[PDB]
């Protein structure tokens, strides 16, 4: 019996917690003697202040204290972000406010003053009574007029952002010797993750001062490292506790001003502090994303093959870096080329500042915005060259042949180098088999008195190792069960299930008996976290050589327990059959026997100096094509997405049932970005989309009756097991394909630039009939 578990559809381990409601979330936590923090936020977009009136706030009963800026610029550093630095140069700042500075305000929703009261009702009751008089300054909003820079945000100025540049060989000759040279600029919409759980933090101090407990949800819960350094009380003593999270999409990823204010205030009062975000707040305070300006250029010959490709990008970072370091901007500038033959290139990314909510990293950050413009310049190019988008992408995709194809673009640091180590294979048979699966041609064939069709491709910077390591640990027990410690984090995508399978496979124990513990920094003093579709080959790779450390620790230890040497039958139950077929020793009894007999019955080998797990220089790049067909009502602005199918090649799907969730779910978040979601600021500076009535989240009825999934496990990469990151591959080309279809269905020019596609824009067909 060699029961296999990886690749199998097994129902999630997380399911029952969430279904019954036994699972606790950050907002669910209660601690006796709690104080409830409410935050007085900005009402100006750009303003310096004189704030001294919390008098009637301080004097309403039930309120224990009101925290001003002067409390917190103290010690009271300003929000550091970490490695990925060089640095070039420099950093400060942003970081955010970073904590309430008693001088200037750089966006509506910025923390200025925190109150502390007994119940959250009384907390904001006192928050109203706080008065701050403002000097309104001029307001910056357009990324392009940020750097043509009058109206400077920082008085030190403090050039807006960081300028990233990457460019191969001889693009001067690649362009100069081209027949069709194509220039167009694209604009992406400002939108984010907007998960269902708003941000929430609970801090309990151990006033014995020794320590501090944080049931806050800080999204690398092993980034106590920041709070520690900031508060100067490091590094244990800041012991983080595990909580379930209601979705993040990287939008919650990192340290916020709220996190430190609470932690500081908790420490210096010896009193537990609780914080729970407004949705409204979330819309003006939680990290933004997606807003770019994509000037692009192409070099093409009479064949239609690529020769040269690129110009400048303007990433609008909002007002501040927020562990939203060039990281994403650096990634974006690395992969606006995707999985194509691109002889040369010229990135000049301008990460810039405006009076908006500080930009973090939304699901597939910088790659939704880039694979849009890239596929919106390719579609446009087919208009002049004259012939099909299908057979353009078809023969200048990614020659292989070529593979390994060390590019092709830069000067390749994505995010460091060198890459693209595209050792993973056949670029094309995906697109080929993806349309041989099976329609596309079948309703390009349309009697089409309705409307039309679209395409788009997405490669992914999706195992950001991180580099070198990731920790893991497996433990067998006296009670039948198995325990797995990991540096992973259940944002709700099924890590605790995937790892259980990985361990199940290697240990020959049902994934039911295995439990997984994460984000509890007392058990797990070191872990990396969960971002950039990574946690399987990294943390699952940790789980493997952990479970593989026990099998030796056990099988070796079992040969000593009976007297048979390490050869037997073949050895799994999980237990130990020597011979064929006398006797046996179970895997748990082995562990139960290693008690206080001079020892210990467990493993945790990742890692040491010269790390473990080892994933270094080159990450895997998964690639995928999205296929869409839309109908449109022209007398109004309506549309009904008739068909949808994202198909992505990624070696070794670990859990097919759950990966389907990660593909479909993401794809919808893409349609949300493509046709519904935009943060609208009024020309003076105030946010307009603050409620849910304004910001449009896709609902059940409007979505495609099915997103089809075409994944194949050809060409496993060489990081055993040969698997890929898949938690982002849904949204990548969701924007471009929708756009192409809309332009194909009208039909004028293939000339759409700005997302989203509002119903007002989409009667420019009233023009067509006129």
């Amino acid at each position: 019996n060699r029961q296999a578990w990886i690749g199998q559809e097994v129902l999630r381990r997380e399911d029952r917690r969430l279904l019954t409601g036994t699972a606790t979330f950050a907002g669910d936590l209660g601690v006796p003697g709690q104080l409830h923090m409410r935050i007085v936020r900005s009402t100006q977009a750009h303003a310096r202040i004189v704030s001294i009136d919390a008098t009637e706030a301080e004097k309403t009963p039930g309120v224990r204290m009101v925290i001003t800026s002067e409390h917190t610029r103290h010690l009271g550093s300003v929000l550091l972000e970490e490695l990925g630095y060089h640095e070039i140069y420099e950093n400060i700042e942003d970081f955010s406010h970073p904590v309430l500075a008693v001088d200037k305000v750089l966006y509506v929703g910025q923390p200025v003053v925190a109150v502390l009261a007994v119940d959250p009702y009384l907390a904001e009751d006192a928050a109203e009574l706080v008065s701050i008089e403002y000097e309104p300054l001029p307001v910056l909003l357009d990324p392009e007029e940020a750097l043509t820079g009058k109206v400077e945000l920082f008085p030190g100025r403090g050039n807006e952002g960081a300028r990233i540049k990457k460019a191969y060989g001889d693009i001067d000759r690649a362009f100069a010797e081209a027949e069709h040279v194509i220039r167009h600029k694209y604009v992406t919409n400002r939108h984010s993750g907007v998960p269902m759980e708003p941000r929430a933090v609970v801090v309990q101090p151990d006033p014995a001062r020794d320590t501090l407990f944080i049931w806050g949800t800080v999204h690398v819960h092993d980034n106590r490292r920041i709070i520690a350094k900031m508060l100067n009380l490091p590094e244990v003593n800041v012991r983080m506790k595990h909580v379930e999270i209601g979705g993040s999409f990287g939008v919650k990823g990192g340290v916020f001003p709220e996190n430190v204010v609470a932690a500081w205030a908790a420490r210096t009062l010896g009193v537990p502090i609780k914080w729970t975000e407004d949705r409204v707040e979330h819309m003006t305070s939680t990290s933004h994303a997606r807003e770019m300006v994509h000037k692009l250029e192409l070099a093409l010959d009479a064949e239609g093959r690529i020769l040269g490709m690129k110009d400048e990008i303007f990433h609008n970072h909002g007002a501040y870096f927020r562990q939203a370091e060039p990281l994403v901007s650096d990634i974006t500038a690395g992969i606006v080329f995707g999985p194509y033959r691109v002889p040369a290139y010229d990135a000049t990314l301008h990460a810039v500042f405006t009076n908006k909510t500080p930009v973090g990293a939304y699901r597939a950050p910088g790659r939704y915005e880039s694979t849009f413009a890239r596929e919106r310049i390719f579609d446009l190019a087919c208009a002049e060259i004259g012939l099909s988008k299908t057979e353009f992408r078809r023969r200048n995709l990614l020659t292989a042949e070529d593979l390994p194809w060390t590019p092709g673009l830069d000067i390749v640091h994505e995010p460091y180098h060198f890459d693209s180590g595209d050792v993973v294979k056949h670029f094309n048979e995906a697109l080929e088999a993806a349309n041989f699966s099976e329609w596309l041609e079948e309703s390009k064939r349309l009697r089409a008195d309705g409307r039309k069709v679209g395409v788009g491709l997405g490669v992914l910077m999706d195992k950001a190792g991180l580099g070198l390591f990731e920790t893991g640990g497996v433990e067998v027990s006296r009670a039948g069960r198995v325990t797995v410690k990991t540096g992973g984090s259940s944002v709700g995508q099924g890590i605790e299930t995937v790892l259980a399978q990985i361990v199940a496979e290697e240990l020959q124990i049902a994934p039911e008996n295995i439990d997984i513990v994460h984000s509890d920094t007392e058990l797990i003093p070191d872990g990396v976290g969960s971002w950039s579709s990574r946690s399987t080959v990294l943390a699952g790779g940790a789980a493997r050589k952990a479970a593989l450390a026990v099998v030796e620790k056990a099988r070796r230890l079992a040969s000593e327990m009976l007297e048979a040497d390490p050869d037997d039958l073949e050895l799994t139950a999980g237990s130990f059959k020597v011979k064929g077929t006398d006797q046996q020793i179970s895997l748990y009894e082995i562990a139960a026997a290693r008690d206080p007999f001079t020892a210990r019955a467990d493993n945790d080998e990742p890692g040491l100096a010269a790390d473990a797990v080892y994933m270094n220089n080159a990450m895997n790049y998964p690639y995928g094509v999205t296929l869409v067909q839309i109908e449109l009502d022209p007398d109004t602005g309506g549309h009904r997405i008739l068909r949808f199918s994202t198909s992505t090649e990624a070696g070794r799907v670990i859990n097919p049932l759950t990966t389907r969730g990660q593909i479909i779910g993401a794809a919808v978040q893409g349609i949300g970005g493509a046709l519904y979601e935009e943060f609208l600021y009024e020309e003076d500076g105030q946010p307009i989309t603050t409620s849910f009535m304004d910001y449009l989240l896709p609902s059940a009825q409007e979505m495609p009756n099915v997103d089809c999934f075409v994944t194949e496990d050809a060409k496993s990469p060489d990081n055993p097991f040969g698997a890929k990151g898949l938690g982002e591959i849904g949204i990548i080309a969701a924007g471009a394909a929708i756009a192409s279809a809309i332009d194909d269905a009208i039909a004028d020019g293939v000339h759409t630039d700005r997302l989203p596609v509002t119903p007002e824009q989409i009667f420019s067909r009233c023009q067509g009939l006129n």
Partner: protein, 293 residues
């Protein structure tokens, strides 16, 4: 979140309610449903000192076919409009119109009496009820008024209800017999506050001219709007894509809407325009009986 502090009471009777909030507050408010008041509280956009819960008062809950009209209690739930009588002539337009009001969860607690007194510019009910020529009885401590729907709707979020007084019941006249009623709206997602919508109702002359027509507009200004002159076109004239198109294209010329987030001014005028003719389409067909179907 976090609504302001207030005192709270449940009224026993229709004049008990009037009696208490009168001396209770210059700024005492009524509640009933909550789906508009309670959220206005979590946004701290309202500061009642006293809240009067009338949601538990006997009479105002039923539906009657009195005389040549139809009586509806003010506390009648949106859901009990999609169900069940429903009412006479039934479907009337309302079960077709209420089916747009947000979702079942909200429709389960939102009252007709609330939406009319709240009077959101984009509220689906008043738009319909104006096309039916509604009549709203409003009891007060002093006496009892009856106000037609035309004067009632003042502005967005403003009604002509005097402070203190209470909307008791809405009665709609049961129109003619065998007439056409339809309602359609456009919105990004099914159930959102619509960009543009229309409710058109046609009565056939059989011999088949048009005897009477009433037309209203969702989101033409600050309130529902009768297109009294666009109706004049249809009168005496028959069927026809053109008379329909001519009627619809002439209902929007007198309209200046508000923007911006979901659409611009002239934009909405053109969406409403296709809403009028489209409703007029099914405003026939439904007008066919003589039954035997």
């Amino acid at each position: 979140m976090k609504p302001p502090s207030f005192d709270y009471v449940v009224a026993d009777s229709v004049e008990h309610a009037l009696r208490l909030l009168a001396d209770g507050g210059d700024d005492a408010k009524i509640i009933a449903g909550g789906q508009s008041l309670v959220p206005l509280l979590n946004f701290r956009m309202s500061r009642p000192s006293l809240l009067v819960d009338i949601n538990r008062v006997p009479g105002l809950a039923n539906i009657r076919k009195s005389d040549q009209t139809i009586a509806i209690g003010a506390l009648t739930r949106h859901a009990k409009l999609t169900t069940s009588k429903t009412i006479s002539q039934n479907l009337p337009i309302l079960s077709e119109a209420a089916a747009w009001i947000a979702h079942p969860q909200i429709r389960n607690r939102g009252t007709i009496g609330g939406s009319l007194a709240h009077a959101d510019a984009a509220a689906e009910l008043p738009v319909v009820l104006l096309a039916l020529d509604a009549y709203v009885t409003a009891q007060s401590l002093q006496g009892e008024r009856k106000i037609p729907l035309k004067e009632l709707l003042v502005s967005h979020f403003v009604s002509s209800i005097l402070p203190g007084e209470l909307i008791v019941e809405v009665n709609v006249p049961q129109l003619p017999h065998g007439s056409g009623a339809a309602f359609d709206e456009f919105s990004r997602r099914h159930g959102d506050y619509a960009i543009g919508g229309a409710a058109s109702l046609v009565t056939l002359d059989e011999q088949g001219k048009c005897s009477r027509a009433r037309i209203t507009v969702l989101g033409g200004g600050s309130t529902a709007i009768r297109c009294q002159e666009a109706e004049n076109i249809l009168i005496d004239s028959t069927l026809s894509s053109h008379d329909i198109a001519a009627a619809a294209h002439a209902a929007v010329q007198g309209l200046d809407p508000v923007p911006t987030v979901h659409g611009s001014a002239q934009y909405r005028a053109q969406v409403i325009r296709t809403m009028v003719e489209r409703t007029l389409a099914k405003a026939l067909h439904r007008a066919r009986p003589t039954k035997e179907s």
